[PDB]
């Protein structure tokens, strides 16, 4: 019984993560100009996950999915170094809105297959999650190809139901 | 190209509006109100075509409900009358002796009849049986 | 001078028709409606519409249009006073004036419209003496149609002789968005219910400031009325001469007085609303209402109408005293308390939800209007000192008085 | 949530527009509260009730995301109401409509052809320029399918993509290979609409698509000798929309090419003679046939057959057919100019007809049929039509009189007389941008200036309520007062022009509130220009310039302040800067 | 009036 | 339907005769032509029933002008129930026979009018008084021949004051219908007897008597004071038309009273609370009283000079009330209330009623023009209205700020810098020309004037006409204010207004500017930047010869339209 918003930059892992959580295999994903919504069930609650694409014409339109969202998933790309600052400004622009102010934050450090891809702690220092005030956040290192860390992010999201 | 299709009554209130051109809502309501007053400020012997902003407006009365279409200055006005008549015949073949009340209470079904007949301002299905048959299979498709 | 008086509907067809002078062509009523929509389109809607040389002076009731025509320079204040007067005459002749009541009562409406106006000139407009000789169930005309006392008939008797006085105050308030009062006035009304026999001569005694200063007792409590409006029965010349409210009253219910004064006292119910509006997310209302009258008084059925956005949704209400419900028909919330004692301050919290897509047009800001009513209470300080009832037969009648303070145009502007 | 039929009944039980608006807002509140709780079951009926609300003319901006949610669901009825709601609510300028490109692209690869045709219908109806770029390859892969139901909608999607983004037009080239060889007439109709869309859009493929002209001729051939069918048939003739679209495509090709017109000319003669004319459908086919014949370079013997068929369209008693004949004779004016002129008595007979559209196309056909032979002969009837009309037609009538007398003037004196006649009779209906053309033709009339200046002076001396007339007249008086007056330096014999009342009536149009604050500037510049050309009156132009130097009109005040400064300090320099100019073209 | 057949027959 | 009703109406028995007449009245009331049934309902006219007589009278009232040559057959029945002992039927017959507006029967009904102007019953006497005016409007020559005007003048002097009130209304109607020969003017004894009849008549008869007093002119000072002292108690009546007619008499009559005595000041102080409480009425009377108050404060501004907060508009006021209340707030504005007026006008521009918002912005400008000491407060109010970034508010605020700047050009140059970057792609040509005039007039402190004016010239031949003239004037003024960087910018503008321009007034202005700049820039500096004098402001105040006549029409359509009554009659 969670409304989950998947956001993040383009070419990143969001649609692959959504159809790994929903179906369970790797599908060929085009860059989604619109959005994808699938409902998954794991420890018997319905995660209605809203994957919205991350091109430059969809990032003003991210704010139409901020309402009633109980948890944010911000999939980041660890392979590129010049776009993690753009992901930082996108995350700080997104988290400063009055809509989506009680939503918890999940950061997926996706695309970790080759050792130029950075790790979760140093991408936390680049994203500035330690300078977040009154925000419940968590970051773990995932890969969408084998689907490791995704269910641990999902059960952190399920663990953060209890208040 | 048909730019828009309007359906309205003797009281001037709108029954159906489909627009194949992009223009804002204030201009939409203003154009619709002045076009309804232009049609309703005309008699029953007044040649069924008005000129309006280099677009000939083809209209035809059938009951208290009016039917209207707006085409460019390259189309046929009498074939636009036949297009209006084919849409009325498709409403006949779907509902069965259609009145204004079927349009009022099934505006979305009349919208589906217009979408199975005209997309983009142009005719997609010329015939009568194929469009009604496609609506019947989409109705039992659910 | 109205040439013809029409009663219409919302479509504008003629419900009932009456010709007085004939200088306006009678088929010009169908030009009244499209002139009305084309003047409503430009924002140039006026009570006096023109069609060449024919002027349409119209009023609008709850269901009907009452239009008067003229070809010349008509006394338009007389025309509008006549139109509201026959609205009042039809409202006492029937239960309520609607579209339906014209059709079954058309014979008596035709007789009334013949009686009320003759050749553009109003003649007999009192319903109580108008019901004496034209009825829905005809004799000689009474003397009171043409007598000096045109409001009260001779020969009416009562077993118990009683006068009921209702001194009704209506507090009008307009404050700014900053919270400073820019308009605070009291419009009063003495509604009198007269059940008396014969030809009584009534003398109303009030604590007038001008009367008390002219007498020499002007040290006690008195009200300084800025303007006084009186009924037809009141002797205005002797009111001007020695501040005397002397009148032979009409039979039944009538409004004797409507006074007006400005007060520098604090408003009776004070509203402070701070709006925590967030764009595309939510709007929050923090409304505190305090009663600034005395603690022994109690305002009953106060309704604090606070406007909300038209696209708002899912209201959450926190209140201390009363109940607050959403009225989206008026695009507002009202906060209904049943009893508001003086000196008490109550709190209300309201939270809505807003769409992520903005509306195409701007909304506008209506003010906060409250709808209080304080019985056994006057705020100006006017008291009825006496009511001398003088009749040639000689009896002892009982004048009963009560004092109600209610809202008028009690508005508080928002941000 | 209440049903859509109950909401429609509750709307129909209202008595007034205000109470209707209260119950609209009361239903919209519950619909928005159901939207906030994210209810999946009644979102379809809530969006449908909001669509009825938006049809009645009420705000429905809060239902666009729910239309996207209905599109993104798996139920067909939810998809149907969501795609209809997308078509009714979103457009190109709504900017939420970009968020369903992925949803339309997912529905285009659906297993259900009705879901696929729903997405094709929504994309071809209202796809923006941004949606048509990343979905054109998805449209083109449905243009090669064997399903006719998807094929006709993909062809009209290709029409919409080409109409929206015309630089994605070359990528539909191999999708139209052997596309006219299909047998079903809806797919054939949409293919013909697609081919005439690219042929009208670009001329580089006209000879490329002219090799299927005999294929179109053969399709029209078996369409005409298809005698009776119980499908594609209304009023006895078969496939009228397909026949009219095929004849429109055959009008589009062959208008400048000869051999396609020889390949098309025989079936144009066969359609123009062997189809019935007793019905509106056959009249539509004959009108598109005569438009095709008089647009292509056809045979001159059957050009006379087109004359005869337009004649029997003209003396048809039906007003629709008379409108059609007037519109077709307006469509062919530049070709067969000898062959349009014999219907002029019939054209001016329907000029006095009671119908608005009949007299409008009759006026435009008479203006297009004005030439240099008996221009006076149509000109008295055109001024009669100007003087005897309901006054919505006077602006277009005066404008057409202006281009007719500009183009086909035999003499300048007649041109000056007819422009004075239409200026005095039309007056306030004269468009204000024609005043530079009137001043330009008057200044080009070099051999006569005094007569037109005297006629403008006599016209204003009657009345000056007509703003373009006084705007022409003030400029002409201020430029040519030196020959409006002649030899009047002192007092002489009584002549009707005596150099005072011209400045008095210029003062009158300056002082009067029945001026549009441009003709006041024309009159002030006229009075200043008259100071050089008048040698009799002094110290009157100066004081009427001086009292206008404190005006509330800022351009008038600036002009009068500059002219007062020139009068006070630089009075010897005014002839160097207030002289006449050479003409322009 | 509104419950009347749209086609002319 | 017609023949069956004709046969049922041509029957004998009374209740179905009454039902046939009732349904023929009902079929007229639903609005169909039923005038072919005329002699069947006209034949049942002398009845003992009075409801039936009233309905047949109503049919004869609205169906005799359509059939004039055949409605002659009711006159003997009319004169036979003009002599019955029931005065209700007598006055009903007189009232109905005055309403038959055909010409050839009015000579046949002068004898029952002469009988009913004379009888002892005041109901039929006051009906016959109005019937004299009805017959005068039909045939004034026949009424003058029969001599009904002399006995209508005799009905001013009798008792029972509704008879004298109806005779006053009828004689006033005949007096304005006359060609103003042989006037019906009245002595001061008649004035005194009319003022005593004013106290004991009905509330509409008070309006008729006070309308007769609005044509009187008093001959001295104490007579005018006595008539004012007897009229002034009518200001406390609940009828707004009685109040407005008394206001009409008092505003006409204090102009003959001299200002030295103390009655003029008390009349000024006591005329103001009826005018203030006129705004608490119904909205139609509110609109009529607002236009009359607009007429009143132009003549006597000292009446309502301290009562200004009653003219502040409310949200539930109608638009005709609000647009006139803004005019009263303009006409009553001063230094003592201009801060409250500016605070109210700042609120009024935040509304959604568009024409009310532009009227409020123009009212801010009119307040800056009228009150000199509040012009910087108005300018800062308009800058805060500009900063709200609403399109019509901004595009009225540049024109209003420019109209302030033409009046006070001395020390308001500090706001041009924040004025010059305020979304200058606005589409209104009036705001465009105002912003261009501000740029060209104050082109000494604008450092980006050329780089804002160069991007404005791309649609020069297709924008407007006044914008082109102001653009040429502003660019010429900028050039000869600073000729360093503007030499290549004025040359393309002179070529753009001379060579490829088609407009002849713009070509005249461009040729005059080009010839002046080619002849002498030293002379051009003195010509173009000449010292512009103080602007003669236009007057919203009516001229006093029209204003004295418009005070004589208070409560009328002339008072609403602010025009003479001859300017809108047809
Ligand atoms: N090596 C590697 N590549 C991945 C992984 N997840 C996704 N990708 C790549 O990402 C490509 C698709 O782009 P994504 O970034 O996944 O798309 P998105 O996250 O939905 O964002 P949008 O493109 O804006 O819709 C796929 O072709 C994959 O090759 C991963 O875990 N490891
Ligand atoms: Mg992906």
Author numbering:
A (entry chain H): 17 to 179
B (entry chain S): 1 to 142
C (entry chain M): 2 to 138, 146 to 423
D (entry chain G): 4 to 588
E (entry chain L): 359 to 367
F (entry chain B): 14 to 583
How does the study describe this entry?
Stimulator of interferon genes (STING) functions downstream of cyclic GMP-AMP synthase in DNA sensing or as a direct receptor for bacterial cyclic dinucleotides and small molecules to activate immunity during infection, cancer and immunotherapy. After activation, STING, a transmembrane protein, traffics from the endoplasmic reticulum to the Golgi, where its phosphorylation by the protein kinase TBK1 enables signal transduction. We find that AP-1 sorts phosphorylated STING into clathrin-coated transport vesicles for delivery to the endolysosomal system, where STING is degraded. We identify a highly conserved dileucine motif in the cytosolic C-terminal tail (CTT) of STING that, together with TBK1-dependent CTT phosphorylation, dictates the AP-1 engagement of STING.
